[PDB]
Design goal:
part of a larger assembly; 5 chains; mainly beta; 282 residues; 32% strand; 17 strands
């Protein structure tokens, strides 16, 4: 079903890299971790890749994935074949010109001299693990790959009035014992299979009567001295194919939990004292 | 044939899925069911796919249908032959990032760990039933397909301003020789040229609680010699169906006429006098 | 003559075999049989050779048919000598590795042990009856050979993105004074011969006049009430028209039925009622 | 006839070699072994050949196979004779460059010094058994020759942007009255009708404590019993390659009829009253 | 025997030449030598042929090697014979027009005059040694022939937009008791049968459990406290054709080194914090 919490805006994030096979922080640790300092974590090998553009967030493209339906003279669609294999990648726009970033765009530094980055002719091999943390309003969706090959995506970009950028493509490659890549958040992947539950709070109501607006459907007034079968029958007047058999309730002193197929809501009540009768989601 | 009532604006909508082959709620039910709460529908286990992008709505595209003319030296238009068969699909932008949406974009989770969603090395297949409901101010056009082969259409999208989006393409396929897809709305397709009126006749009966069924559900309580107004109250509302305002009635002697948004038939009889209760359509 | 159903596109079609000398379905049966199920036919001997390539269709080749001139000093051509007698064959590209299609390419299975298909070094005699049914949009040119000798034509071909194929050549052989092979289709071989016929219907005309196109010329102002002989005169009166005795005309009610050497069709028409004048070829 | 299962696409596969005359795994084993580790096979040594080209797959060619007609003036076609007998071969197109592959292309290493491979002459004899396994998503057409003679087919290919290649022709030869070669698959070449079933009985015994033989292996300790799952386990849950869910066991009387992916037989026996455990084919 | 490090791409490489009989670098020197300065090597006498085309690499062809099988009236298909002796060669496309590259193609300079290179009628001998080094990204497959005879293979190629080229063919000839030619590489020709072994780290994580994925089959759960014999019988428990006699397990203090007939991978980890569980090759 729908939930507003898992709608994502990438308002800040961090890209880290390490030697191949390295472990990212657990889905629990991503809520406690200090993101600025990967030398200080409970598990280590990550270094922060340097500043990445705010204009061009990382793009998780893929090449390939074509297919054709192979026929025979006697049956027009016998099976499909994959005519070019998929290749997933991410493209990242680094914006430091430091050693930590030129070494990902050009590969390993090829001079021993102080103060110089040398690069040398022809095709070259360069590989790393990745961790990407995306964060807004204290929800912290991670992404991790056990290895990728790192390659020049496009020209180094320079302008006089916006930061320079080194576009790099990390093509994802298999590391045998593990997934190709994985997404990390304790609140919303492999979560608890718990139902949505509602609570009725007496609110200190000293007397009088109240109503409920379940699924936007009204019901007749019920006295403040309510009980489980009274609220079951009072909401069970839905007129929407969901009678009193559709609902589950617990006694809970005076502040009943309610469970059922559609949302509980407060109607109108006589406010003899306290807040009056009150409704919540658990 | 100009009709302002059917010039659709897609002001809101909903998208739902299930295991292949499920039935969408019938053309009359779709006008009545509550859209945010699939488990309330009294139909089957449809799941709401999560939030879907509120701009760049679904497009019901097609590929192929190119065709060539084949000539002979003495007749230039002798025959025509299809280059490829018309293959058609809907493309959808999912905007939640939890397992409810990643299930459609990547396929199902490849890891057991709580808080992790793992992705495979390649070639996952993800056939699913699809239902879409488009919602103007009150008109309620549905679309249903028994079997669609879901896949990724393009890279996932991220921004610091706009919501993130996962684009999926759902190609339609043959399920048990049934329709490839179908559009469901009671008032627009295969419409009745005049309102359906059911007729009842008690057959000279003179006793008993002999009672109807409506919309496929047996009715609570109807009896011999009941007035038309009592029959009006004893329909719909008492069955947790639509209220007394949804229905029309007329009667004289043993004979009654009924109309409303749901079908009518005989539920129970035991023939105290006469030939028993009888029912049909005008 | 020109005909436009007799031009063949081999869009789908089936290949069968049986013991030497056996009978095919007759031309009148072949229109009605179901082709995937040789057990259900009245001619009980047949079985399919499995699936066949969609691109490398059967090739009905021949080799030999080569001859040279003989003469003498006084007279330079006097005899011809047949240098190499013609031998027609068909090359079939089987694409299936079941026993039912290896046993054509390799000859009989050489092992009694279950699940291995043994081959041996000496060449082996292998002869079958052959039937092919080329299904052009449910027009069915059949082909049948009473005896053919089957040999491997070329290497087994394998690919990663196309089906493996087993090219086999069937060379046709004489058998007990039956035909070398025969093509079977009820519509168009040895069928009864008669002139083309045209029909026109005035379509409810209470009055008016009309024109026929004939041999690309036109005949003027025929009234709705003209008799069969009078419209034969109106056709025969055309300047490029053959003699008035060469046409034939007949009539009943609102319609007239016609034959002759040139084609005839509706020109401009007028009526005081009905759908206008109408025409077709019988 | 017309199976879709047997329409092989050779998308992946392996090649192995061994001393002349070596037995392959049987067609029932070939469906359950793992291909990449031939130390595990319960068979004498089938060493892998190394990597083979993606696209230049093995081609099962033949040379020769030509014949001529003999006659006299009275009788033009009385006899036929071979001009060149059939000579079957396969062209394996290797890409690994170490001593694993060079001993097929050049013959055995001529130099005893470490780090060097030398070669000397024409007419180096190089005869070894061959096994090939094409794989197409859990159908596994094996091919086996008791001996082949290997020679180089063509020049060594080198390139700057594609793998080098060492093409070898393996030519098949007769050996010790065995087949020239055997194609191996249990689902295709024999016994594709209803599966074989085996008896078991209490046999009227007053007890029992005696084991089975399954897949030609012994099984864990077992005794006279009421429950068919206690026969399913200890036929399955054995270190022979198959899960217990692959088997089925009946309970229609004192009889426990069994069927599954491997044969079953008597391991140990004694009468103990009764007559015997009775484990023959049904 | 699959070894991904031994699948050669000839991306860069060098060609050298010297007086007949001269010795190449030993396989242990071949990793150390500076390939652009033969004047510096421990093996005196080599110098470079100069630049070679990138498009057309050394072609290690051969001519002849034709063979047939023959027998007698006494005895059918008795013996193979090689009807002409196989003649190996390599073709090198030179591209320098300097004297050091004209001398391979035309033989020695026929003029003493400074600044010209005369050529003369008839045969010229030009026998010399050859060394080739193919450099796939820090593996260096050498090739050496103690005597080759060098003849021009084709026309000098000239073009306006591509380097001009001189194709020379070096035919290989037998010299004293030595091999015809040798491939030199320390890692992978006549090398030791180096064991394949897996290391299960377990370098932390006191508490909880893991599986192992062996031959692609998961064993059951095993705890962090387990000893070598417990790990052995857990690995030996799988269905797949192997038992505790085939495996070895050893320990460096709670850190396990293991070997056997199948590959081993991490499967599933559920141990405590500390990141201890990991398995990889030695």
């Amino acid at each position: 079903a729908l939930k507003d919490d898992a709608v994502l805006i990438a308002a800040r994030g961090y890209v880290y890299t390490a030697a191949v096979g390295t472990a990212a922080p657990t889905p629990s640790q991503l809520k406690l971790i200090d993101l600025e300092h990967p030398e200080a974590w409970d598990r280590t090998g990550w270094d922060l890749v340097g500043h990445t553009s705010e204009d061009d967030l990382p793009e998780f493209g893929f090449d390939g994935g074509d297919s054709e339906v192979r026929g025979s003279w006697q049956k027009k669609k016998l099976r499909e074949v994959e005519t070019e294999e998929i290749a997933d990648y991410v493209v990242i726009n680094l914006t430091q010109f430091d050693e930590t970033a030129l070494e990902l765009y050009f590969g390993p530094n090829q001079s021993a001299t102080p103060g110089i980055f040398g690069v040398k002719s022809g095709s070259v091999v360069n590989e790393r693990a990745l961790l990407i943390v995306i964060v807004d309003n204290d929800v912290r969706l991670g992404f991790h790959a056990r290895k990728a090959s790192l390659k020049r995506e496009d020209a180094i970009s320079l302008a006089t009035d916006e930061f320079g950028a080194l576009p790099v493509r990390a093509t994802f490659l298999d590391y045998q014992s593990y997934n190709l890549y994985e997404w990390i958040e304790e609140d919303w992947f492999n979560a608890v299979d718990a139902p949505v539950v509602y609570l009725l709070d007496l609110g200190g109501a000293t007397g009088g009567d109240y109503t409920l607006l379940v699924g936007g459907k009204s019901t007749g007034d019920i006295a403040y001295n309510a009980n489980a079968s009274a609220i079951k029958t009072a909401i069970g007047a839905v007129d929407d194919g969901v009678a009193e058999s559709a609902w589950t309730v617990t006694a809970d002193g005076s502040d009943f939990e309610i469970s059922g197929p559609l949302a509980v809501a407060l109607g109108v009540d006589s406010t003899t004292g306290g807040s009056g009768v009150t409704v919540d989601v658990v």
